[PDB]
Design a protein around this ligand. Structure first.
Ligand SMILES: [Cl-]
Ligand SMILES: [Cl-]
Lengths: 948, 935
């Protein structure tokens, strides 16, 4: 079995050099791959394994020299597979790619930071290898900017970093498989301890193989397209994985860094430097599976998970808190609590003596935590309870008060060190996670609210709120919000949709405010949308109404946004309701779908500038909420510079960002990855408040305005004006298959009969990610740079000045370059040849030329000859993934030709050893061609991760 | 604050060299001491801290040169302390000693093994630094002994090591402090990772200090002398600490070591190589606090703890077990289980689909585990339940069956590797811990059974079972055991004691058999005692009766033991009840109190010889149960050779050993320490089965016979014949204070008006441990070795040959030598000066000379010039503790003079910044914790 000698060779040819001296990535991937291939052989035979390995080697040769002969060879092998073998090959390559991502996480997580590799400017902040840690950022603020430590500490206490978890656009991988990935990562890591004993190393190898096989032998389909509650349970995995333990660890490190510049205090235990919000179960925009009851369910589930974790943690806290000397106040509380009926620690003590007052108070808190979980579970499972609300924690102050009493008391007695142990970690967890871990945002289209108001105004014979001009809408909305009469009752003709909207508001009213974040209006355009939501909130008896957040998606919505926000602040009722705080949401991907990526990036910079102008004019604290697709939505290092790049004063101590589902594993799956994530968010926020990026030279603005015009013209002329483009998009791309299959819970279009305008941005991105073409990300850049270069020979120099000195531009280009690295036009060509009509082939050809031209231009702009010349670590990891992804592409393409064309008979090969073909019985397509397709989609999706 | 610079120096003067190259012990201790003293200064002031540091510095100087002027300085300082400062100093030194123990454990656990330091013979097995690990033991068996790997594996399959956890003779430390010790150990260890980042090292230091203060700032008194359930709760901590996770780890290591000698199989997951038994809540011998309700409570609590640990463990198993391919049998069970009513994993899955059958069956197991804990809890807190016993696991087969089904199924599908992951660990945990973690032994005096039967026979107008000869007792007991008519009813006049015994049997009868181990007859002497327990068990309607274990204590009881056991095997009823398995208990400490330690050691060797002769004659698998005080009861390395030293075939694949309370933290507190404990017990047992120690040369046996005669003559002439001894023992020693104070739950004597015969062995040992004198351990060895040396010039050569070549002798001597290391006659002399009458001073003076002579003779026998010449690591660790313990000694002695004599006014010093009984208790617990185990 000298088979290993082959994969090593291929791997080392894929990543030739070393990206450092602790570069063990090729080693890691070889080890994992060898163990996996042996498992494949032991379960499905020597022939199956030899086939799979020949496929991998061919793919690696392709990602090396990009000879199309290699694609012809891969295809030749893959078409001759009957559905059984096709499923096993696709599954095989999905799992192999997963293992590659695992070795990547280990390598990243243990790479030694090179203090000599820092250049000294902001470019260092674009990679984890040279970015500033917390303390380095403190020293940067103090030295270069001559800020006093007191100013840094004060800035930090009032800072909030709000991470919003959203559902994954495809396979939000099951919590079980995450657990397995963890065990594999740990086995890998421990195998490379430079001090390990032979028997230890043996048992670790056997454990690694054992877990690789375990993960391979779990189905990844069947059952249901998981219900929204299931998707939410899966999203909450990272709290148990890393985040719960990770928050107090990060905060304590902040304490140390503050000590290391002379600050004697710690960050206050109730200060919300970290917050977590969730859309899982709250975003109903174009997702009818998300019902009112779904929202009630995920709210209660969250309250359960939080109470559970607090329950388990408070027992170790009770064991720690064995002191006797205490404050007079706490002694009073102990004697008071000692007057009662001790069920949840009979294994520990028959009862708790008054000589352990801390243990008394804490034991009572433990009792209240148990009753909160039991009552939430009864509310979820029935609808009523019998657990009195007076015996649980209903708001966060009830919970914090006894703990703060213990802390104060301990400090009174000079036991501050004891107080700063498990107790401090507990207080910080209560403050960060509250009673729910996450706060659920609600999201709905503006049109649904307009429908509701129109049904009401029709029911009152006042006219159609829909037909009303925006000024008439505003005037009516204002008179009603200021009025004393309720608006509607049960006697109201409600369509199924209008009933959905109102019932959602009623659910919101019947749940604790600690559970909710923001109500977000998709497709916001005018103040009447926000006012409409505010009115529906009031007239549905939502006692503590949510903050309303407009999501300005389209380009015209962005230009009109600051006018709208000004008009909203200028209204007396709204101005007093917001209490000096406004949060606006921007969607990088939505605006991209509208008007191309370059024009949307620049328009979003300008729109944030104007919104901060309005917020200062009227004295409101503006908070920008960054939706998916952004520069700040990337994974790892790049996030640091992306945040630093935001226009001055757009953050101001409140960062709200979407943690994309395709990135959450790379950012929170591992202990170090999580810590460094929280760190770069906190450090980037803190620094940007005090050290904004340079303001752009006026010529830079004028240039970007012109480029945006040309770029929008090209993007729209292709996507929207070319009549046959929609024909091409349906052939060269599996967009239709994505809409039909059990990959995401959402419909891909808002109106089934519409063109690209009615297509949601996620299937738009996804469709072109699968073919490694990435049109939605780069289309429009080519003609823009081409235009400015021809318009004046010297504009190229200006662009290069921007990339080297203007952060926003550098990060935008950098993102484009990263996406091009995940691109391969040759594969897009394979899809054309197999799936697209002949008279449409030149169309694709022209598109690919644009692809190529743009790439060259981006390179010229970035001053690079190769893609990602400045980040060889990422270039390496990407190349390693690409070798697996390419096979999944070819398999996807031929599987598509096989599905769409039953008149494409192929010379099948004999089946390859023991089955997986009988796990999808009720399939209308072939015995396992639907499953093969789903596998390649989940796989390519996992390999390409994030683009735009 | 350069005060730290002093203590380092003193420490380095205490242990001059390095016992290796990874010897960071002095560094560890210096760090812990510096951090602790800074804490003391921060809580009670610079004056208090400076006082404590002067005390330790002087103590270290004393342990250096042993100048009694150093003791005069210590005393002069400690007497001028009012009770408040006295308490803070005593508490302080107790915790300093604990920190010494913590660093000691870390040093031990991370000491790199030196393979070039092995000499090749059995002496290597007396220290962890050179003992054979599992794999080295295999290669020893295969190469030198020509045992085949098949033979090794079959031997292992059938082997059981049963470790019996007993209540602490003093302070069974609260589970909270065990946890804090864990955090201190972990912080210390990680600070010395040769890869640590500056901020990590900083936060680790702050966590270290924080935890030292946390442990120092908890009271250790008040409330009650904790209830038996409380002491039991504390004893069970080590399952959570290390043992639960640690057992599957060790078993997997066995599997690996087997692969490395060609065995492809794993040790069967249902093989009980490791077992845990408990006395906590079961030993009633001279201990009235242990009632029937206590036994029921610790039983139910135990089943609760186990049910919890299984419950928590099975959720990760459920996440791992996501396969879909399965056996036809398992698939049927999944569809079967899928026909039912899922409340305990709604945070995980709405429900478990039949596409995940393993998860289905396991989820059901999780459910049944939940109902089991809940039912046990309701029985404990109330007395009845409503949780159907059919909805719980009542016996181990119900529990194992679905799990074994999962394993079979996974193997059927070529998923054996997945099966050998979390699932195998789980099976091995069910088999090792069962439904109770531990199996409780019950223990009672034979005399109580005599009382009960005498009330019965008197109630039947047949006469007094007590006045009856032993043969008449036997004959009646046999007639009843072979008979079909019941013995007694509710109409039976029961004294509180007789009602107690019968009620204990009724509770055993009303609880699952899996909860209980062995019924132990203290002061057993004749077959009628065993038979008596058997009958009382039967006529109390105990469905599955316990195995009865006689404890032969006195020397005459040991001589008469094998005759008795032969007589029991010769009776048809007993022969048919035991089913070819017999367990006898021997008490090394018990027999020592009777007749001196040397004679008890030799008598126990010979007695085990005779017991094995008989057990082979009648074809029974004899299991010797080693009570407290043995060589095999030591901590760490020495246990290996002690086990190897037992007479051939006394073990025969079943070792039962007492884990003394004074050793359990050193043996299971840390992950590595626990593994190495389970390992050395498992390896030593396996080897001894196939490689029995040498048989003794007859001149050796004759010499030991003679030495035993002289030794008992001396021990008895001093302890029992000297008329003033009892007066001396009451003054030179805190025995009276121990009996009156809240140190142990047990009364120190069986009959208050008796002499030493009625004094229990534990207070006997403890009393002389407190004064660092240890008379119960070495007294009698002196006159024995002196006698044989004078009788013939060459007998010293014979003794040295025995020490160099007979393991039993080497381990006996070695234990004595270690005890002498923990002795200091000078401190005993201080106690004499303060607390003993003047006309009794030569008496003490004389005994101390005996001490010295005995020590000299022991050294000559072992071929040593200094004590513990062969184990410098232990010599070092002990030397380090001595400096704290000595301060605790001086404090105790002057506190005793102050307590007993209110006519001893002292010039107290002003109280030192932010009630003598509490001080005394502190010093006793402290000296107890520093001396750990002796004899
Ligand atoms: Cl109890
Ligand atoms: Cl649900």
């Amino acid at each position: 079995l000298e088979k290993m000698a082959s994969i090593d060779v291929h791997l080392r040819q894929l990543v030739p050099g070393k990206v450092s001296e602790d570069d063990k990535l090729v080693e890691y991937d070889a080890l994992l791959l060898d163990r996996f291939l042996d498992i494949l052989q032991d379960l499905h035979g020597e022939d199956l394994r030899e086939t799979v390995q020949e496929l991998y080697e061919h793919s690696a040769e392709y990602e090396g020299k990009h000879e199309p002969k290699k694609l012809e060879e891969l295809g030749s092998v893959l078409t001759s597979l009957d559905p059984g073998d096709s499923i096993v090959i696709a599954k095989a390559f999905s799992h192999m790619l997963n293992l590659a991502n695992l070795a990547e996480e280990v390598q990243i997580a243990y790479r030694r930071r090179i203090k000599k590799l820092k250049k000294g400017d902001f470019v260092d902040e674009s990679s984890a290898t040279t970015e500033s840690d917390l303390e380095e950022t403190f020293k940067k603020l103090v030295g270069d900017l001559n800020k006093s430590p007191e100013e840094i500490f004060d800035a930090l206490k009032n800072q909030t970093v709000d991470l919003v978890l959203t559902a994954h656009p495809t396979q939000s991988v099951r919590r079980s498989l995450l657990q397995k990935h963890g065990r594999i990562r740990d086995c890998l890591a421990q195998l490379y301890a430079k001090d390990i004993t032979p028997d230890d190393k043996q048992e670790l190898d056997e454990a690694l193989q054992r877990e690789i096989q375990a993960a391979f032998r779990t189905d990844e389909i069947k059952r249901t397209p998981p219900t929204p509650q299931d998707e939410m349970r899966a999203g909450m995995s990272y709290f148990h994985e890393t985040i719960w333990k990770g928050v107090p660890k990060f905060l304590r490190r902040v304490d140390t860094a503050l000590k290391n510049i002379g600050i004697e205090e710690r960050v206050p235990y109730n200060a919300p430097l970290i917050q977590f919000s969730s859309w899982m179960g709250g975003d109903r925009d174009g997702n009818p599976r998300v019902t009112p009851e779904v929202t009630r369910d995920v709210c209660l589930l969250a309250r359960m998970m939080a109470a559970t974790m607090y329950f388990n943690q408070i027992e170790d806290l009770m064991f720690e808190m064995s002191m006797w000397r205490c404050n007079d106040e706490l002694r009073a509380r102990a004697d008071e609590v000692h007057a009662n009926s001790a069920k949840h620690y009979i294994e520990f003590w028959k009862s708790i003596p008054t000589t352990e007052p801390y243990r008394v108070i804490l034991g009572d808190v433990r009792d209240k935590l148990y009753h909160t979980r039991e009552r939430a579970h009864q509310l979820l499972s029935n609808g009523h309870s019998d657990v009195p609300v007076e015996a649980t924690f209903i708001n966060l102050e009830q919970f914090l008060e006894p703990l703060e009493l213990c802390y104060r008391s301990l400090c009174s007695c000079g036991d501050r060190p004891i107080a700063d142990g498990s107790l401090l970690d507990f207080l910080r967890q209560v403050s960060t996670f509250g009673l729910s871990l996450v706060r659920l945002d609600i999201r709905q289209e503006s049109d649904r609210h307009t429908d509701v108001l129109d049904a009401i105004t029709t029911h009152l014979d006042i006219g159609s709120y829909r037909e009303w001009s925006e000024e008439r809408r505003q005037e009516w909305l204002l008179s009603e919000l200021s009025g004393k009469r309720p608006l509607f009752g049960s006697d109201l003709p409600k369509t199924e949709e209008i009933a959905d909207v109102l019932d959602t508001f009623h659910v919101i009213a019947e749940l604790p405010a600690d559970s909710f974040g923001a109500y977000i209006i998709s497709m916001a355009t005018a103040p009447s949308d926000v006012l409409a939501v505010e009115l529906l909130q009031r007239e549905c008896r939502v006692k503590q109404p949510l903050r309303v957040v407009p999501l300005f998606e389209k380009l015209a919505d962005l230009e009109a946004a600051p006018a709208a926000v000004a008009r909203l602040f200028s209204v007396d009722w709204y101005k007093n309701r917001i209490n000096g705080k406004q949060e606006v949401m921007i969607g990088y991907s939505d605006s991209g779908k509208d008007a191309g990526r370059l024009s949307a990036a620049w328009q979003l910079y300008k729109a944030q500038e104007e919104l901060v102008k309005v917020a200062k004019e009227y004295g409101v604290k503006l908070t920008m909420f960054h939706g998916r697709g952004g520069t700040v939505g990337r994974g790892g290092g790049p996030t640091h510079l992306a945040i630093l790049s935001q226009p001055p004063d757009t953050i101001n101590g409140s960062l709200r960002v979407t943690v994309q589902g395709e990135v959450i594993e790379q950012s929170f799956g591992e202990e170090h990855l999580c810590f460094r994530t929280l760190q770069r968010f906190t450090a980037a926020t803190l620094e940007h408040g005090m050290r904004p990026p340079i303001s752009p030279k006026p010529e830079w603005r004028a240039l970007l305005d012109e480029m945006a015009v040309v770029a929008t013209e090209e993007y729209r002329s292709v996507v929207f004006q070319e009549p046959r483009f929609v024909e091409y998009f349906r052939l060269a791309t599996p967009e239709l298959e994505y809409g039909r299959m059990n990959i995401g819970s959402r419909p891909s279009k808002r109106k089934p009969s519409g063109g690209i305008e009615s297509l949601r941005a996620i299937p738009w991105i996804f469709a072109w990610i699968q073919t490694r073409f990435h049109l939605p990300v780069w289309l429009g850049f080519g003609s823009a740079i081409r235009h400015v270069i021809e318009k004046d020979v010297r504009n190229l120099h200006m662009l290069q000045d921007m990339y080297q000195h203007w952060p926003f531009f550098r990060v935008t280009i950098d993102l484009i370059e990263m996406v091009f690295a995940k691109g391969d036009p040759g594969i897009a060509a394979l899809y054309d040849k197999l799936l697209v009509s002949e008279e449409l082939w030149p169309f694709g050809e022209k598109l690919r030329a644009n692809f190529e031209e743009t790439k060259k231009l981006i390179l010229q702009t970035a001053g690079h000859k190769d893609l990602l010349e400045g980040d060889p670590y990422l270039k390496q990891r990407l190349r390693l993934r690409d070798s697996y992804i390419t096979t999944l592409n070819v398999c996807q393409a031929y599987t598509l030709k096989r599905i769409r064309d039953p008149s494409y008979h192929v010379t099948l090969r004999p089946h390859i050893s023991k089955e997986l073909i009988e796990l999808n019985p009720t399939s209308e397509y072939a015995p396992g061609l639907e499953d093969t397709l789903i596998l390649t989609m989940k796989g390519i999706a996992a390999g390409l991760q994030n683009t735009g």
